[PDB]
Amino acid sequence: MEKILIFGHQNPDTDTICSAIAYADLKNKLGFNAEPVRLGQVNGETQYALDYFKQESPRLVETAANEVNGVILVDHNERQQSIKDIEEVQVLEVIDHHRIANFETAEPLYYRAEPVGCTATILNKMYKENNVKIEKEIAGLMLSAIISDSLLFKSPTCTDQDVAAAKELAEIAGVDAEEYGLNMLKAGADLSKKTVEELISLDAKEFTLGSKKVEIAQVNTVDIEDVKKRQAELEAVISKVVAEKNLDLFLLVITDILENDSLALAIGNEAAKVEKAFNVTLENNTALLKGVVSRKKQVVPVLTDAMA
Amino acid sequence: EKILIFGHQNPDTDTICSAIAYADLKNKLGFNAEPVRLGQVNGETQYALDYFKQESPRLVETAANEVNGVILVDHNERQQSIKDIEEVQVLEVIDHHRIANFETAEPLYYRAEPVGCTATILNKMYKENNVKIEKEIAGLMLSAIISDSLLFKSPTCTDQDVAAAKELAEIAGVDAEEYGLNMLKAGADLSKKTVEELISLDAKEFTLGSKKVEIAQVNTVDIEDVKKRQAELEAVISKVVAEKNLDLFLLVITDILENDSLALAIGNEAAKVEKAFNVTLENNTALLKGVVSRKKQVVPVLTDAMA
């Protein structure tokens, strides 16, 4: 039975890891042959989820074509967010909830995107459509992904489907969603053991907006001040990436998970487009983005219009 | 609140019927939708529309002057879509083709399934939503399945297409084989058709790698009747190739009974058809044995051959 790899994006975050694992489990329980893999380091928020439900980290890979002919993408589609040799394998399926860009197939495929809060909310539907029982631990991972991408049901991308799925999965997982969730989020906001290199890359995503190359990284915190004090070190690693990747903008979004506001740190030739996008004034490369917690909904589209 | 729902340019039966069917589904769910079309309906689709007593959807050229949001069925690629697609928001796509030349600013509902046509997906969507399919909508969806499967002979026809067709034929009240042959043959009537109509009635544009292509298909019960108009076909095709800067125009002349196609290839990359199908072009043509499906049996091998 032909082997496939399932993976999320570069710089893996909780949905990318947990949805890879969940979808491979769904494929395997249906008699197929799938391995969840990951494309980079597991962050602390995902580590808490993996440790709590006693699941191993997916195997790390840099390429797929040496292993398989066919892959499934979860939690992304854009080539530059994907495995470095994506053009050498066939994308059989994509399960996702982001905008579509920089993605092309030679052939028809199963492409399933729904504008909900995360991939795990779609996978929950798919288990039910396929009459496959969700194990306790898988449900905990899928619940973990929903909490992560909704910031405990606070993000404006959180839909009623996400809430309903979290309720089902918390019950299957045997945990109280708010208690577990707070602890998971706090574990990823523990920025004490983290270098600035880790801070700008743990949850970083590349995009092309119009003709401009951008990178938007996100970090969660309970105190924006404790990130802000590392600004000079942050601008040093950021401007190094800006040069290396020829970016027009690197935007770091430092998210206060208590207040649901973010401090932006914008470096690059197009930094002023951030002022236009958010109606905000950059002072010493930063500005408070009030209520802004979601990259796909509150950053990407307004930045696209601004840079156009 | 008002949205338009349409298929691709040069409408074929799935593109007309699934726009109508999905609009029906949305309206029954209390939303505000109208099915539209982007060009002329062919004879096959007209048969379907006549048989189930449905009018042709309204013809539009643009959308941003009426609505802000649209739903695409049966396609995604910008160049197959409405001329001002970049002016509107694509809310949803329901499709069964390769994805290319398609980008959104925002998350959306994108549902592609590698089945025989869009109507097979929409059949599943009526059930998911618990909405009855009216008799005539069912006949239009059956039409779409028969059209794209060539009466269940195409290798793109899946078990899901077969099962949907059996449910829809029973709701519509027709014998699928009897009605299907007649619908197919109505589209295979090439007599009163000009060559301009032959190369455009079911023509789709693609970019394959860097190469600009157009691949058009016509159904026939005698390949030799359309082959007798080769000189005339070569003049209208040559004109399109120059006007649109095509590297390749490929006319696929499909024998709907024998499941074979005659290729007619014009343009700088005409020799890639030889490589793609392991055939030899004789006077710009070659018989493509068993080749019936553009999305599954033409576009991918051509893409490889042209890379």
Q: Which of B76, B89, B92, B99 to mutate to test the interface with A (most CBs of A within 10 A)?
A: B99
Q: Are residues A6 and A122 in the same domain?
A: yes
Q: Are residues B226 and B261 in the same domain?
A: yes
Query: Is residue B84 classed as helix, strand or coil in its secondary structure?
Result: coil
What CATH number is given to the structural domain containing A137? Answer: 3.90.1640.10
Q: Are residues B121 and B205 in the same domain?
A: no
> Exposed/middle/buried for B233, CB within 10 Å: 0-12, 13-18, 19+?
buried
User: Which backbone phi and psi does A139 adopt, to 5 degrees?
Assistant: -55, -40
H or E segment to which residue A95 belongs = strand A90-96
CA A82 to chain centre: 12
Residue bearing tokens 């001002």? B84
What CATH number is given to the structural domain containing A300? Answer: 3.10.310.20
A261: Cβ–Cβ under 8 A, 6 or more apart, which residues? A255, A288, A289, A290, A291, A292, A293
> Exposed/middle/buried for B273, CB within 10 Å: 0-12, 13-18, 19+?
buried
Measure B96 CA to nearest chain A CA, in Å: 6
d(CA B220, CA B256): 6
Q: Residue A235, Cβ neighbours under 10 Å: how many?
A: 18
Q: Are residues A133 and A211 in the same domain?
A: no
The answer to whether A34 touches A6, Cβ cutoff 8 Å, is yes
Instruction: Please report residues of B whose CB lies closer than 8 A to that of A107.
Output: 98, 114, 295-296, 299-300
Q: Are residues B243 and B296 in the same domain?
A: yes
Query: Is residue A85 classed as helix, strand or coil in its secondary structure?
Result: coil
The answer to whether A282 touches A265, Cβ cutoff 8 Å, is no
| Best CA proximity match to A101, nearest among A121, A82, A122, A88 | A82
Number of structural domains found in chain A? 2
Give me the residues paired with residue B89 across strands: B69
d(CA B261, CA B82): 29
Sign of the alpha-carbon torsion through A120, A122, A128, A131: negative
The answer to whether B298 touches B217, Cβ cutoff 8 Å, is no
Q: Are residues A176 and A202 in the same domain?
A: no
Method: X-ray
d(CA B288, CA B278): 9
Q: Are residues A88 and A169 in the same domain?
A: yes
Instruction: Please report residues of A whose CB lies closer than 8 A to that of B99.
Output: 100, 103-105, 109, 111
A98 touches chain B (CB under 8 A): yes
Strand ranges of the sheet holding A249-256, from the earlier edge strand across to the other edge: A204-209, A212-221, A249-256, A261-267, A286-289
d(CA A217, CA A84): 19
Q: Are residues A152 and A4 in the same domain?
A: yes
Contact A99 B97 (CB under 8 A): no
Strand ranges of the sheet holding B260-266, from the earlier edge strand across to the other edge: B203-208, B211-220, B248-255, B260-266, B285-288
3-state helix, strand, coil in chain B (%, to 5): 40, 20, 40
Q: What residues of A form the annotated binding site?
A: 9, 13, 15, 75, 97, 149
Contact A99 B113 (CB under 8 A): no
Q: Are residues B169 and B302 in the same domain?
A: no
- Whole-angstrom CA distances from B235 to A281, B83, B195, B199 are 61, 26, 9, 11
| Best CA proximity match to A221, nearest among A267, A187, A175 | A187
Closest residue in chain B to residue A113, using alpha carbons only: B110
Question: Count of alpha carbons within 13 Å of B250, Cβ hemisphere only?
Answer: 31
Q: Which of A77, A91, A107 to mutate to test the interface with B (most CBs of B within 10 A)?
A: A107
Strand A34-38 to A90-96 pairing: unpaired
d(CA B109, CA A122): 11
Domain assignment of residue A176, given as a range: 1-189
Instruction: Locate B227 and state its tokens.
Output: 């082959």
Contact B98 A111 (CB under 8 A): no
- Quick one: CA torsion of B125, B128, B133, B138, rounded to 10 degrees? 40
Tell me which of A165, A189, A213 is where a domain ends. A189
Give residues after which chain B gaps, C-N over 2.5 angstroms: none
Q: Are residues A212 and A175 in the same domain?
A: no
Q: Are residues B146 and B64 in the same domain?
A: yes
Tell me which of B171, B188, B205 is where a domain ends. B188
- Quick one: CA torsion of B126, B129, B132, B133, rounded to 10 degrees? -20
B130: Cβ–Cβ under 8 A, 6 or more apart, which residues? none
d(CA A91, CA A100): 14
Instruction: Locate B272 and state its tokens.
Output: 């890639």
d(CA A188, CA A186): 5
The one-letter amino acid at A1 = M
Tell me which of B173, B188, B203 is where a domain ends. B188
Instruction: Locate A242 and state its tokens.
Output: 């800006």
Instruction: Please report residues of B whose CB lies closer than 8 A to that of A121.
Output: none
Q: Diameter of chain B by CA atoms?
A: 57
- State the DSSP code for B153: T
Among A103, A157, A300, whose Cβ lies nearest the Cβ of B99? Answer: A103
Nearest-5° Cα angle at A157, A180 to A288: 90
d(CA B121, CA A112): 12
Q: Are residues A50 and A194 in the same domain?
A: no
| Best CA proximity match to B118, nearest among B192, B21, B200 | B21
CA A139 to chain centre: 18
d(CA A295, CA A304): 12
Give me the residues paired with residue B258 across strands: none
Q: In sequence order, what E strands does chain A have? A: 4-7, 34-38, 59-60, 70-74, 90-96, 110-113, 204-209, 212-221, 249-256, 261-267, 286-289
| Best CA proximity match to B34, nearest among B58, B13, B16 | B58
Query: Is residue B252 classed as helix, strand or coil in its secondary structure?
Result: strand
Strand A110-113 to B260-266 pairing: unpaired
Q: Residue B88, Cβ neighbours under 10 Å: how many?
A: 20
Q: Residue A131, Cβ neighbours under 10 Å: how many?
A: 8
The answer to whether A20 touches A76, Cβ cutoff 8 Å, is no
B290 touches chain A (CB under 8 A): no
- State the DSSP code for B134: P
Strand B203-208 to B109-112 pairing: unpaired
Contact A106 B113 (CB under 8 A): no
Exposed e or buried b for every residue in A261-297, given b needs 16+ CB within 10 A? bbbbbbbbebbebbeebbebeeeebbbbbeebbbbbb
Instruction: Please report residues of B whose CB lies closer than 8 A to that of A301.
Output: 105-106
The answer to whether A146 touches A22, Cβ cutoff 8 Å, is no
d(CA B24, CA B126): 10
d(CA B106, CA A3): 33
| Best CA proximity match to B144, nearest among B185, B116, B124, B170 | B116
Closest residue in chain B to residue A118, using alpha carbons only: B107
H or E segment to which residue A209 belongs = strand A204-209
B210: Cβ–Cβ under 8 A, 6 or more apart, which residues? none
User: Which backbone phi and psi does B285 adopt, to 5 degrees?
Assistant: -130, 160
A211: Cβ–Cβ under 8 A, 6 or more apart, which residues? none
d(CA A296, CA A301): 7
d(CA A21, CA A7): 8
Residue bearing tokens 């399926």? A93
Instruction: Locate B87 and state its tokens.
Output: 């002016």
